[PDB]
Amino acid sequence: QESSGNKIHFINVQEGGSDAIILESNGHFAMVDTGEDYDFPDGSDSRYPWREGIETSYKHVLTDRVFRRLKELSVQKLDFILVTHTHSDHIGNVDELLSTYPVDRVYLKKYSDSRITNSERLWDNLYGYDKVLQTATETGVSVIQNITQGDAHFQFGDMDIQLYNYENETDSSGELKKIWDDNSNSLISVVKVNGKKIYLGGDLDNVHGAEDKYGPLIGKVDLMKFNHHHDTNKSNTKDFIKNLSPSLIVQTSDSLPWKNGVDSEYVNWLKERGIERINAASKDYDATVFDIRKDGFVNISTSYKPIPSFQAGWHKSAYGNWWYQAPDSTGEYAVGWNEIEGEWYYFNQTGILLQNQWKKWNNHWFYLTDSGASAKNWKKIDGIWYYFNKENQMEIGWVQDKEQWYYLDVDGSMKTGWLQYMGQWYYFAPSGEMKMGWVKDKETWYYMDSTGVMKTGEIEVAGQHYYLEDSGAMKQGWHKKANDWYFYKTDGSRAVGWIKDKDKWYFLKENGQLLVNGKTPEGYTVDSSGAWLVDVSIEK
Ligand SMILES: C[N+](C)(C)CCOP(=O)(O)O
Ligand SMILES: [Ca+2]
Ligand SMILES: [Ca+2]
Ligand SMILES: [Zn+2]
Ligand SMILES: [Zn+2]
Numbered sequence: 001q002e003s004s005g006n007k008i009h010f011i012n013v014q015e016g017g018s019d020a021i022i023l024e025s026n027g028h029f030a031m032v033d034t035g036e037d038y039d040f041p042d043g044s045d046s047r048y049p050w051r052e053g054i055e056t057s058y059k060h061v062l063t064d065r066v067f068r069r070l071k072e073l074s075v076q077k078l079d080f081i082l083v084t085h086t087h088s089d090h091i092g093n094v095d096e097l098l099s100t101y102p103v104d105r106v107y108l109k110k111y112s113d114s115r116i117t118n119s120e121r122l123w124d125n126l127y128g129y130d131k132v133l134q135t136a137t138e139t140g141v142s143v144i145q146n147i148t149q150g151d152a153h154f155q156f157g158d159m160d161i162q163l164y165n166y167e168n169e170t171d172s173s174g175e176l177k178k179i180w181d182d183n184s185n186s187l188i189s190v191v192k193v194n195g196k197k198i199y200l201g202g203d204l205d206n207v208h209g210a211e212d213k214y215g216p217l218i219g220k221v222d223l224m225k226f227n228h229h230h231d232t233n234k235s236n237t238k239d240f241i242k243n244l245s246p247s248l249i250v251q252t253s254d255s256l257p258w259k260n261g262v263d264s265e266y267v268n269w270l271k272e273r274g275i276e277r278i279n280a281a282s283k284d285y286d287a288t289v290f291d292i293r294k295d296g297f298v299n300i301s302t303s304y305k306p307i308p309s310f311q312a313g314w315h316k317s318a319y320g321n322w323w324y325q326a327p328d329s330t331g332e333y334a335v336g337w338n339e340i341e342g343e344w345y346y347f348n349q350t351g352i353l354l355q356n357q358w359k360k361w362n363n364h365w366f367y368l369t370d371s372g373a374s375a376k377n378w379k380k381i382d383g384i385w386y387y388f389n390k391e392n393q394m395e396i397g398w399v400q401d402k403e404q405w406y407y408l409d410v411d412g413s414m415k416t417g418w419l420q421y422m423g424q425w426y427y428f429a430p431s432g433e434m435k436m437g438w439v440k441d442k443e444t445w446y447y448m449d450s451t452g453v454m455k456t457g458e459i460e461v462a463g464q465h466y467y468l469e470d471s472g473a474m475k476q477g478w479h480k481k482a483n484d485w486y487f488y489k490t491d492g493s494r495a496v497g498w499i500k501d502k503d504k505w506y507f508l509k510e511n512g513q514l515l516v517n518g519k520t521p522e523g524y525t526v527d528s529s530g531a532w533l534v535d536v537s538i539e540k
Contacts, residue, residue, distance in 0.1 A: 003158050006193045006292040007300070009069060010225070010250055011035055012282035014330055016060050017229030017253035018089035019202060022069060022287070025157025025193065029070075030079045032189050032200050035062025037092030038335050039349045041127040043362065048127040050362050052120075055088050056336030058329050065286040065307075066093050067100070072286070072305060077102040079156055082189055083132065084202025085182040086111045086125040094128075095135035106136055106143045109187055110168045115176035125182055156191075164188035164214050165204070183228055183235075184208045190218060194294045197221040199244055205234040215243035222247055223290070223297060229253035232263045246275060248297060250288065254281035283307070283330050307331065322353035322372065337361075343373035344392055365394035365412060377401070385414035385432065405434040405452065417441075425454035425472065445474035445492060465494035465512065477501070485514035485530060505532040 003026035011020035020035030038061050043050030055061075078101050083091050097103065111129045113122050136143045144151060145168070152163040165188045169177040179185060186202035199218060204210055204227040211227070224246035227235035230253040249270070257263045257270070257277075270277055278299075280288040284306050291298040312327040324334040324347065333351040337344060346354050346361070346368055353372045358365060358381075367375040367388070374392040378385060378401075387395045387408055394412040398405060407415040407428060418441070419426045427435045427448060434452040438445060447455045447468055454472045458465065458481075467475040467488055474492045478485060478501075487495045487508055494512040498505060507515045507526060514530040523540040525533045 006158055007289060008191075008198065008223075008292060009287035009289045010252060010280040011062055011065050011069060011287050012280050012285060013062070013252065013254055014059050014283065014332070015254045015281065016089075017251075017255070018060060018062050018092075019084065019225075019229075019252045020062050020066050020093065021200065021225075022073070023156060023159065023191065024073065025159045028079050028157035029073065029075045029077070030081070030156055031097070032082045033084050033090040033202065034081060034093035034097055035066050036060050036089040037063050037096060038333075038351065039092070039096075039131075040088070040336065041124050042336075042349070043360075047130075048124060051123050054124045055092075058326060058332040058334050058338075060089065061332050061335075062089075063093055063096065064330075064332050066097075068307075069286045069304075070101070075101060078104070080105045080107060082107045082187065083109075084186045084189075084200075084204075085109075086129045087182060087203060088124055088128050090202060091128040091132060095131040098132075098135045098139045098141055103136075103139070103141050106132060106141060107147065107163075107166075107187060108132055108143050108145055109147070109166070109185060110145055110176060111182065111185075112176060115178055116182060117178050117180050121181045158193050160192040162190045162192070164190065164217060165210060180207050181205070184210060186210070186227075188214060188218070190221070194292055196223070196292050196294075196297070198223045198225075198292075199246070200225045201227050203228040203235070205231070206237050206240070207234055211235070211237045211240035215240045218244060220245050224249050226251040226253070226257075230255040230258040232257050232259045232266045236266075238269070241270075241273075241275075248276045248278065250278050250280055252280050254279055317352070322355070323347070323351045324353070343371075345372045346374065366392050367394070386412045387414065406432045407434070426452045427454065446472045447474070464492075466492045467494070485516075486512045487514065505534075506530045507532070 007024040009022040018036045019033035021032040023030045023032065036055055040054050040056055041048035081094055081097060081103055083094060083106065111125060113126050116122055133143060147163065147166040152166050154161055165186060171177055183203035183205045184207050186204040188204060189200040191198040199221045206212060221244045224244050226249050230251055257266045278288065285301050285304060286307060287301065289301045291300045307330050310325055310331040312325055315323050317323060325331060326334060334347050335349055335351055337346055346359055348354060354368045355372045356370060357368055359368055367379060367381055369375055375388045376392055378387055387399055387406065389395050396408045396410060396412055398407055407419055409415050414432045416428045416430050416432060427439050427441060429435055436448050436450060436452055438447055447459060449455055456468050456470055456472055458467055467479055469475055475488045476490060476492065478487055487499055487506065489495055495508045496510060496512055498507055507520045509515055515526055516530045517528055519525060523538045525536040527533055
């Protein structure tokens with residue numbers, strides 16, 4: 001007849017892989033996935049702990065591109081948002097979209113962290129999933145989580161849409177069947193219009209037999225979105241592509257088909273088949289766009305406005321805060337940790353630079369200085385010395401720096417004075433360094449060995465002898481070792497020959513032992529205490 005047109009916009013990545021797809025049909029708009037969003041959980045909420053691999057790079061955020069395309073299309077409302085799975089690069093902008101546009105319904109299969117067998121593949125799935133459910137209820141939007149056969153087949157404008165892999169698969173106890181990764185759970189969408197079929201399968205893989213199962217059921221299509229961006233290890237199996245036999249494959253990725261490197265053999269196998277393969281990646285246009293005509297798909301991408309220019313660098317908001325647009329971005333702003341000209345800066349999820357504050361991140365403490373730059377090496381904060389390692393983490397415990405040892409307390413604060421560490425005693429200077437050798441604390445001397453350990457008992461250093469008491473304190477004056485008396489001088493050193501103590505003269509032998517009841521080398525007499533009997537005449 002005469003509708004206003006049928007189009008599909010695959011939002012272009014800057015790099016990496018992410019799915020956001022706009023369906024346009026006779027003035028109706030809907031989305032299949034929504035791309036990566038700026039937002040992410042920082043670990044401050046125990047429900048959504050920080051996990052290695054959660055996306056924080058502006059290079060992977062599709063938010064600007066999604067909302068620019070919708071605005072450029074004069075979208076007033078979305079008939080539906082379909083979410084294929086809970087990965088941030090698919091579900092990311094759903095809540096932002098629900099906050100921005102009226103939405104009639106969201107398709108969202110059940111998820112829980114428990115149904116994923118691998119701890120290492122949880123990331124921020126639940127955070128993204130909860131955002132959809134929470135924001136949908138807050139904006140009045142029905143979430144279809146229990147898709148019936150009836151639900152699975154519906155009209156959208158001129159488009160006929162059929163879903164596959166839509167059921168929640170459960171065990172005897174009604175809890176979700178376990179899978180290796182949420183990719184296996186991908187909600188499949190097949191779109192029919194103007195005699196053309198388009199397959200849209202999110203990150204579908206064959207680990208739990210999904211490609212084996214749905215290949216034969218889906219059958220011949222024209223345009224196939226590649227499953228899972230670029231992967232050929234577990235997705236896009238030969239049987240699946242033979243079953244669908246597309247003339248055109250669109251990858252939502254800047255990468256070639258990939259399996260530990262370019263999968264050149266798979267690339268060639270696709271060519272031998274006459275399949276056209278296109279990457280939805282661009283620095284210049286928000287989307288790879290096809291006009292879906294009876295006589296074929298027309299690439300109309302460049303018929304839209306190019307991405308606007310931007311001024312790179314640091315920018316100051318109206319409220320005095322800082323945000324940043326990297327010169328290698330296409331306008332997307334920095335969030336989370338970002339290395340900028342040799343310093344590390346942390347930006348919150350809305351893109352604001354944090355300054356002059358402690359920040360806990362992935363179980364370590366960081367201090368963001370005046371400029372925002374994370375502290376490195378010694379830093380004095382609120383009157384206390386702290387030490388930050390080469391990775392900006394506040395150190396605790398023993399730290400070696402510039403050929404000296406330091407100890408940082410449990411709260412990061414530098415230790416000075418006495419420390420009992422692992423059953424032994426150490427002493428740190430007021431400037432923090434662990435002291436070796438002779439150290440004066442208050443009005444007592446102590447002797448620490450080469451490793452800083454306070455010594456006890458008799459010692460010899462540089463030809464002189466000292467006695468350290470059990471507490472470590474250097475002895476001064478009289479000391480009995482076994483059956484002999486010794487005298488330690490003011491400097492601690494063991495005396496030899498004649499010494500004067502308390503107006504009496506005492507003779508210490510070669511070996512430091514006190515002569516008692518006998519004659520000195522010159523023939524003087526000493527009493528039982530070793531004191532010289534002054535009245536007794538010299539006698540040789
Ligand atoms: C969630 N994630 C983006 C960190 C992992 C990658 O997800 P996927 O697109 O490879 O399935
Ligand atoms: Ca995100
Ligand atoms: Ca979001
Ligand atoms: Zn993905
Ligand atoms: Zn995925």
